[PDB]
């Protein structure tokens, strides 16, 4: 089997950037290279076949070049929308192979989270498990901290969070952090707390409620 | 442009078999369709990146496979009704994943003028469809609990409200999520769902409207449809 090896492994880049990808193959493959385009939860799309040839459709600021074991993928100008995964994938012999990808990431200007909380809803309660659920949305860059505090109590191991891919527009992400505890605890405190630090914000903001209000 | 469309995925236990379909429509140069091409199955396991399993002619010859799925999957397509299949036996849970069917550039056969290109080229692909999920496993479909996220007084940020759904509890991937019956779009953001202690996922969809919502949660394993309303406490 032919092992196509891409970096890096993940590539930052501003918008209108020129941007390199690069893939290289276990063995000579002439030119029997292709490349794919994939967003997160799609098909792969063609974007270059036999090495330097731009399928019909796709953008022009796409090219590709190289020939035996290394080859590129070139961006000439990098869009918003242009953030991904990239293949490279190999047809000198069977089994066909694709690499591990490449995946894209836009740097862009900070922008600070507007954050959200909600309580545990009536039905839910109804069933012994409460959960809590804070939003912090359209923000960048993606590093943030969430915290917990019950009652001013700081929280830790009882919650999960979770990212957006990379907004193909905007390039932002938004976060939900999600604090499940069981029926009798959430009875037992009243102020809930959401405290959120970044870089987009001076100084830490907090959201809260308390219960049954 | 030749379009494809698979279907045929589902939850299955270990050792079970499954048939997965894949219907071409559209059409090509000189008016092909999906019969004049090779084509080839590819999957993508859950996080993972892409592994080309199988590949047929246009004809239904000149067929291989890899070596993972060699003697449990079989490859063939009925022209007629322009429909590619994969029969899969004895699946095992590494099995899991999203299946794609692609189809290779190169024209390769003309029936109307009893053409047939001599040689396999199994060039790039140029056309894949959307994919159909498949989960091996021994574990029970479960389906979601949905309870509203309420937006409340003092909830404004920024100059606009946030309001939700949290679809909690179920198994396994995936649930589609939309909203009013897909008349609201703006400002939707459905998060990857993430997997709890208890063995079962958990994921929020949430809406920002400025300053009626219902959502429509949907989880075909269990055969779930629930439309929630959302309202403020």
């Known amino acids: 089997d032919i092992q196509l090896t891409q970096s890096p492994s993940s590539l930052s880049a501003s918008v209108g950037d020129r941007v390199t990808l690069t893939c290289q193959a276990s063995?000579?493959?002439?030119?029997?290279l292709n490349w794919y385009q994939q967003k997160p939860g799609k098909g792969p799309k063609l974007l270059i076949y036999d090495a330097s040839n731009l399928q019909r459709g796709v953008p022009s600021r796409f090219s590709g070049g190289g020939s035996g074991t290394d080859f590129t993928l070139i961006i000439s100008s990098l869009q918003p929308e242009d953030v991904g995964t990239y293949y490279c994938q190999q047809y000198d012999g069977l089994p066909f192979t694709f690499g591990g990808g490449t995946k894209v990431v836009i740097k862009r200007t900070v922008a600070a989270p507007s954050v959200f909380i909600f309580p545990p809803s009536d039905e839910q309660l109804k069933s012994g498990t409460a959960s809590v659920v804070c939003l912090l949305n359209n923000f960048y860059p993606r590093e943030a901290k969430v915290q917990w505090k019950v009652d001013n109590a700081l929280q830790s191991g009882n919650s999960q969070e979770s990212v957006t891919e990379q907004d193909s527009k905007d390039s932002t992400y938004s976060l939900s952090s999600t604090l499940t505890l069981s029926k009798a605890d959430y009875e037992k405190h009243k102020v809930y707390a959401c405290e959120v630090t970044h870089q987009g914000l001076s100084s830490p903001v907090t959201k809260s409620f308390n219960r049954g209000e | 442009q030749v379009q494809l469309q698979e279907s045929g995925g589902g939850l299955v236990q270990p050792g079970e078999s499954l048939r997965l379909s894949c219907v071409g429509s559209?059409?090509?140069?000189?008016?092909?369709?999906?019969?004049?091409?090779?084509v080839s199955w590819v999957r993508q396991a859950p996080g993972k990146g892409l592994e080309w399993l199988s590949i047929?002619?246009?004809?239904?010859?000149?067929?291989d496979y890899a070596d993972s799925v060699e003697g449990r999957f079989t490859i063939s397509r009925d022209n007629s009704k322009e429909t590619l299949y994969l029969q899969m036996t004895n699946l095992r849970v590494e099995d899991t994943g999203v299946y794609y069917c692609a189809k290779h550039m190169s024209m390769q056969q003309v029936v109307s003028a009893g053409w047939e290109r001599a040689d396999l080229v199994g060039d790039a692909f140029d056309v894949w469809g959307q994919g159909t999920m498949v989960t091996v496993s021994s574990a029970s479909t479960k389906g979601p609990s949905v309870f509203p996220l309420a937006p409340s007084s003092k909830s404004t940020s920024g100059g606009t409200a946030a309001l939700g759904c949290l679809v909690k509890d179920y198994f396994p991937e995936p649930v589609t999520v939309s909203w009013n019956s897909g008349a609201l779009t703006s400002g939707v953001h459905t998060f990857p769902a993430v997997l709890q202690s208890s063995g079962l996922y958990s994921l929020s969809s949430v809406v920002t409207v400025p300053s009626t919502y219902i959502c429509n949660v949907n989880h075909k394993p269990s055969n779930t449809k629930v439309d929630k309303r959302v309202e403020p406490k």
């Open positions: 047929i002619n246009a004809g239904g010859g000149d067929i």
């Open positions: 063995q000579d493959i002439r030119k029997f």
């Open positions: 559209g059409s090509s140069f000189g008016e092909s369709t999906l019969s004049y091409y090779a």
